[PDB]
Design an enzyme around this catalytic site. Structure first.
Site, short mmCIF file in Angstrom:
data_model
loop_
_atom_site.label_atom_id
_atom_site.label_comp_id
_atom_site.label_asym_id
_atom_site.label_seq_id
_atom_site.Cartn_x
_atom_site.Cartn_y
_atom_site.Cartn_z
N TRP A 1 0.85 -1.19 0.00
CA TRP A 1 0.00 0.00 0.00
C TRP A 1 0.87 1.22 0.00
CZ3 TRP A 1 -1.85 2.32 5.19
CH2 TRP A 1 -2.89 3.24 5.03
N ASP B 1 -0.27 -5.90 9.53
CA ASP B 1 -1.25 -4.91 9.12
C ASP B 1 -2.55 -5.66 8.75
OD1 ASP B 1 -2.68 -2.67 8.22
OD2 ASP B 1 -1.27 -2.22 6.55
N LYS C 1 -13.14 -0.44 7.26
CA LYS C 1 -13.84 -1.16 6.20
C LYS C 1 -14.82 -2.24 6.69
CE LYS C 1 -9.37 0.11 4.70
NZ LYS C 1 -9.92 0.95 3.62
C1 LIG Z 1 -3.42 -2.29 4.10
C2 LIG Z 1 -4.05 -1.05 4.67
N1 LIG Z 1 -3.62 -0.59 5.87
C3 LIG Z 1 -4.12 0.49 6.47
C4 LIG Z 1 -5.14 1.18 5.88
C5 LIG Z 1 -5.62 2.50 6.56
O1 LIG Z 1 -6.99 2.46 6.94
P1 LIG Z 1 -7.59 3.57 7.92
O2 LIG Z 1 -8.21 2.89 9.08
O3 LIG Z 1 -8.69 4.34 7.13
O4 LIG Z 1 -6.44 4.43 8.20
C6 LIG Z 1 -5.64 0.80 4.61
C7 LIG Z 1 -6.70 1.51 3.93
N2 LIG Z 1 -6.71 1.40 2.65
C8 LIG Z 1 -7.11 2.35 1.81
C9 LIG Z 1 -7.61 3.74 2.25
C10 LIG Z 1 -6.54 4.79 2.20
O5 LIG Z 1 -5.70 4.82 1.31
O6 LIG Z 1 -6.61 5.67 3.17
C11 LIG Z 1 -7.06 2.19 0.27
O7 LIG Z 1 -6.19 1.54 -0.28
O8 LIG Z 1 -8.00 2.82 -0.40
C12 LIG Z 1 -5.08 -0.33 4.03
O9 LIG Z 1 -5.50 -0.83 2.84
#
Ligand SMILES: Cc1[nH+]cc(COP(=O)(O)O)c(/C=N/C(CC(=O)O)C(=O)O)c1O
Ligand SMILES: Cc1[nH+]cc(COP(=O)(O)O)c(/C=N/C(CC(=O)O)C(=O)O)c1O
Lengths: 401, 401
Positions: free
Chosen positions: A133, A214, A250
């Protein structure tokens, strides 16, 4: 010549910036497939049923808004550990862990990275998989660690490059740090097979590396939570004490509420106490204490039997729907008359599809069709509905024909 | 010999830790006067009326929980700037500012400190006043800046040491950074007089120092918001472009929701754009995007005429009540038969009183009376109610008699 005359125009985020651009388009047929945000079958934001009820309960009780402890809401913290670890776990049972509320997945990841920078005396290197990511890089980089890499995906074959993975991993210097995605690898959507995971375990154990997990997608890779937490759990019972980050963004559709957690598996409950002590001290001068709303909601869901079960049917449903969009996508592709092999689309799991389109195609997609996705070919199939799967397929076809 | 065998037991927070200890006491007469948290006249947590209504509006509209932009909710951001700056302001009017949602006052302060560490090319020193809020030190320290000091309070006289302040300030090297509290200095409760503020302005201007304002208490120093924002505004119209941090934790009783903002006063609207760009890039790998609940509530309050006015009557009432507890405290003191001069108690403004008790007295207070406050003699008079002002006074007297 003021204070900020030298400060340059920085560029928009490769992922989040997609939403900004999409917002501005006037094409009524526009679709936002950049960020991984789940949409219902009508292409609309979806607040789970169980969330709406948790909320109502919170409302009726007339709760205060007093500050929460630096480590977060106890009940939410104990519940997340339990959710990752499984109730029968010895680590859980024995109290060898410390879990602390964090500002969603990102927040947690950064608290962990900061902790490491400060207490992980054996190395400054974090090994990310190729690819990983986008955000992992800068989170580790601003925290003060160095970035490294391990082979993972093979774009020739649209799959896991196990041989390269193992090669690379078998050579990482001992006592280094390795980031592994628990399940539903982002952005490839390809995970190691169980047997593959058993093998990885060995080497990690063997090389004496700190495993950093993660876990942003528990329940989205298979539609089953326990099943999706398998690898993580297997590492721990093999005797690997990992650090872990969780997001409820999510799986519970709590995106903007910012609920999440960071955990450390220690030797005893006494070590856990000291670690706790130090994590508090890091967080204090960061944001003092964490946001209460997402934590209050999640705790209620996780800790309330009927709410928990409803939530699990809800996660299944979302996962299922995703599967149906994958299927339909492929099928329409054929119907449109694509020559290409779109099998990867149905083979991958989770919220996205690592399509393969080049950047010139991505460009055309937005410009002629108003379909927004990231420049690396990643699309959020989660944001696709029955009414626009045909539109999507047709475009994909045009720009690929 | 695991990974964390060397990690030591860190100590509990000098302020927040007070709540932890207080929670554990079994004495029914216990009082928590450590953290500055407002209590109603019954000694109970208070969620303002206007907050409860904002909430209800949010509820009824069935809002989604989608991620917010990296910079926060637009409407909340524009509204906070307006609230600090005043609607008629040229800086506001002209668009020369950038305001970004932050994780309350602490959060904002840290984003600002981080920004500075990264873009303030002229100095690594931040000048805090003696004394200042405990947390200012570590926030600046973990961000990567050096800490300095300027004379402020004079414990002999229970007041502002203007001569020392000016001396010290007139010698700070040009282009250094100075932290000033907007109003209701924490923990002294003593502010500069307007004329005094005009004088400070000159020197700051004169020495060409970056003024960093910490505004955690707008509306608590006098009960009037515009009046409490005077100094900040006067600096700007003298041509001093300051950086500023805001908290809505106390004035709106949104403690655990974590709503706040960080602002930069730039040369033009074009500079503001670039600064914005860079702040986003800092925040992204920090927590990605901010919590939505406190921001949603505040925006509604600030942007809704009837809600805003109600809020202003509510701030007045809280401020007034504090005044009544001060009065009563002093009076009971006399009634109990204290010899000491307790005039400072009624002279100071804001949520606390910088009492003067020594640490042996603080100790006894907790132990015989179960009255929790910080070790420096600071007490939160805001957390005092009509039913326990007598209890408080009597204790103060016993341990001071
Ligand atoms: C692997 C991974 N780790 C952490 C997160 C962060 O999630 P949060 O709880 O909102 O901080 C995300 C979110 N994925 C995406 C969202 C982004 O880029 O903020 C995505 O790939 O769209 C991940 O895909
Ligand atoms: C001057 C000052 N600045 C910033 C803050 C941080 O507020 P927040 O929005 O909650 O991060 C506080 C809070 N003051 C106290 C609370 C604390 O220590 O966390 C206090 O002195 O009790 C301040 O007094």
């Amino acid at each position: 010549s003021s204070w900020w005359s030298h400060v340059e125009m920085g560029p928009p985020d490769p992922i989040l910036g997609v939403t900004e651009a999409f917002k501005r388009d006037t094409n009524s047929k526009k679709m936002n497939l950049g960020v991984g945000a789940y949409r219902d079958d009508n292409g609309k934001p979806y607040v789970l049923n169980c969330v709406r009820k948790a909320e109502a309960m919170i409302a009726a009780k007339k709760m205060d808004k007093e500050y929460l402890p630096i480590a977060g809401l106890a009940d939410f913290t104990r519940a997340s550990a339990e959710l990752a670890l499984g109730e029968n776990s010895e680590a859980f049972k024995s109290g060898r862990y410390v879990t602390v509320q964090g500002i969603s997945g990102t927040g947690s990841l950064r608290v962990g990275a900061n902790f490491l920078q400060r207490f992980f005396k054996f190395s400054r290197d974090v090994y990310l998989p190729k690819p990983s990511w986008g955000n992992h890089t800068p989170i580790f980089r601003d925290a003060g660690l160095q970035l490294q890499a391990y082979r993972y995906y093979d774009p020739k074959t649209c799959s896991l490059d196990f041989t390269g993975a193992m090669e690379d991993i078998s050579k990482i210097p001992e006592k280094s740090i390795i980031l592994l995605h628990a399940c539903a690898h982002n952005p490839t959507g390809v995970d190691p097979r169980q047997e593959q995971w058993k093998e990885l375990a060995s080497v990690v154990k063997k090389r004496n590396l700190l495993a950093y997990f993660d876990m942003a997608y528990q329940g989205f890779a298979s539609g089953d939570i326990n099943r999706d937490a398998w690898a993580l759990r297997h590492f721990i019972e093999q005797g690997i004490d990992v650090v872990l980050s969780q997001s409820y963004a999510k799986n519970m559709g709590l995106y903007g509420e910012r609920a999440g957690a960071f955990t450390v598996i220690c030797r005893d409950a006494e070590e856990a106490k000291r670690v706790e002590s130090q994590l508090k001290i890091l967080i204090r001068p960061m944001y003092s204490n964490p946001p209460m709303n997402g934590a209050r909601i999640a705790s209620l869901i996780l800790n309330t039997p009927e709410l928990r079960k409803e939530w699990l049917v809800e996660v299944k449903g979302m996962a299922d729907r995703i599967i149906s969009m994958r299927t339909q996508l492929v099928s329409n592709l054929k119907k449109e008359g694509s020559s290409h092999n779109w099998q990867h689309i149905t083979d991958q799991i989770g919220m996205f599809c690592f399509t393969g389109l080049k950047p010139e195609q991505v460009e055309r997609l937005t410009k002629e069709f108003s379909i927004y996705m990231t420049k690396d070919g990643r699309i959020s199939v989660a944001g696709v509905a029955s009414s626009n799967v045909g539109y999507l397929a047709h475009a994909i076809h045009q720009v690929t024909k």
